[PDB]
Design a protein around this ligand. Structure first.
Ligand code: NDP
Length: 325
């Protein structure tokens, strides 16, 4: 009876969501940008021993476009759960409002409109948001201070306009705000849950494509193998994926923001792990790091209690990432 729609299903996080849904036996519909991406994903699922009869794809070439999901939800009236995992990709930015904040905000509204009008059987929407909407960064960072599932990044709309880096952060905050504004205003019959991941690391659900460059967050790792250093909170992608299932499965997740952050990390600390665990790689050397004393402290025991499983630690995450390469 439960049919789960997953937007942008070929992505790094979304492929792990799709794999997790199928291991749990859920009928799954993934949106892909092309027939080839859909056939490719189905073949990955087949070659992994999963029941590929549980998976189908729909072609949605442009996920932020007006009405982009209208036809998919006509063709699949059985959808009861909609995991909106993806925001449209962005590239070289010249107009931060028009190229970053606008497509992010309008993309989520356009998706919510289509769900409300065409997804008449949808009971739960899960929004993949971001830890960026929860804690403050750069000069707005609050090192030593606690953030929890109710905290918001204080960045204002105008502050987000200043440069692409803050525009990306602001895009996450104000896209999620658009969802909250849509609920209060239009009062849809479906319930919402948010998953707010920090830096997502870990192995790909199925396959390599190109060992030379992985998804953006995992370039924190592959850059070392291949370096802009980083600091903050990490979360293993498999924990992000499991959290999306709990997000629609439980009643206590309605109106909740699940803070998907495990433990602090640095790029140097990840290099230390690769140095100790992969001796045939003795790599590259750096030193210009940040120290975590720019980061808020995460209190997410509420999330960890709702999720009810133990997170994968950084060593296992990094080890599993390297093994695929
Ligand atoms: N990874 C992280 O650390 C975090 C990621 N997120 C968010 O989660 C989402 C995906 O994360 P991740 O999986 O890591 O990124 P990936 O690049 O691995 O996945 C990107 C996905 O977005 C799809 N996509 C992008 N633009 C469009 C578009 N215009 N029309 C249709 N499909 C589109 C891609 O389609 P194709 O496969 O066809 O290229 C791909 O499926 C992003 O929105 C990201 O901001 C949130 C918090 C942290």
């Amino acid at each position: 009876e439960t049919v789960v729609f997953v937007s942008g299903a070929t992505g790094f996080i979304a492929q792990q969501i799709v794999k997790t849904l199928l291991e749990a036996g859920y009928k799954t519909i993934g949106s892909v940008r092309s027939e080839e991406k859909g056939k490719y994903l189905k073949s990955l699922i087949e070659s992994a021993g999963l029941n590929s009869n549980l998976f189908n794809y729909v072609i949605v070439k442009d996920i932020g476009a007006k009405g982009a999901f209208n036809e998919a939800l006509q063709a699949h009236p059985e959808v009861t759960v909609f995991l909106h995992t993806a925001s449209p990709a962005t590239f070289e930015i010249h107009d931060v409002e028009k190229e970053l904040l606008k497509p992010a905000i309008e993309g989520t509204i356009n998706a919510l409109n289509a769900i409300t009008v065409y997804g008449k059987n949808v009971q739960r929407v899960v929004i993949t948001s971001s830890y960026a909407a929860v804690a403050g960064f750069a000069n707005l960072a609050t090192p030593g201070k606690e953030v929890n599932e109710e905290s918001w990044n204080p960045i204002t709309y105008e502050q987000a306009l200043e440069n692409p880096f803050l525009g990306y952060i602001g895009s996450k905050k104000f896209a999620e705000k658009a969802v909250w504004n849509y609920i209060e205003e239009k009062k849809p019959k479906w319930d919402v849950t948010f998953v707010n991941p920090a830096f997502v690391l870990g192995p790909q659900a199925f396959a390599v494509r190109d060992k030379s460059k992985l998804n953006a967050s995992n370039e924190i790792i592959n850059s070392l193998l291949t370096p802009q250093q980083f600091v903050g909170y990490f979360i293993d992608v498999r924990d992000v994926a499991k959290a999306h299932l709990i997000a629609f499965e439980k009643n206590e997740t309605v109106g909740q923001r699940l803070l998907l952050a495990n433990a602090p990390f640095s790029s140097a600390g990840i290099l230390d792990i690769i140095e100790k665990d992969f001796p045939n790689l003795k790599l590259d050397k750096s030193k210009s790091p940040k120290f975590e004393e720019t980061e808020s402290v995460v209190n997410n025991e509420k999330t960890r209690r709702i999720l009810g499983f133990k997170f994968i630690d950084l060593k296992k995450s990094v080890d599993d990432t390297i093994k695929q390469l």
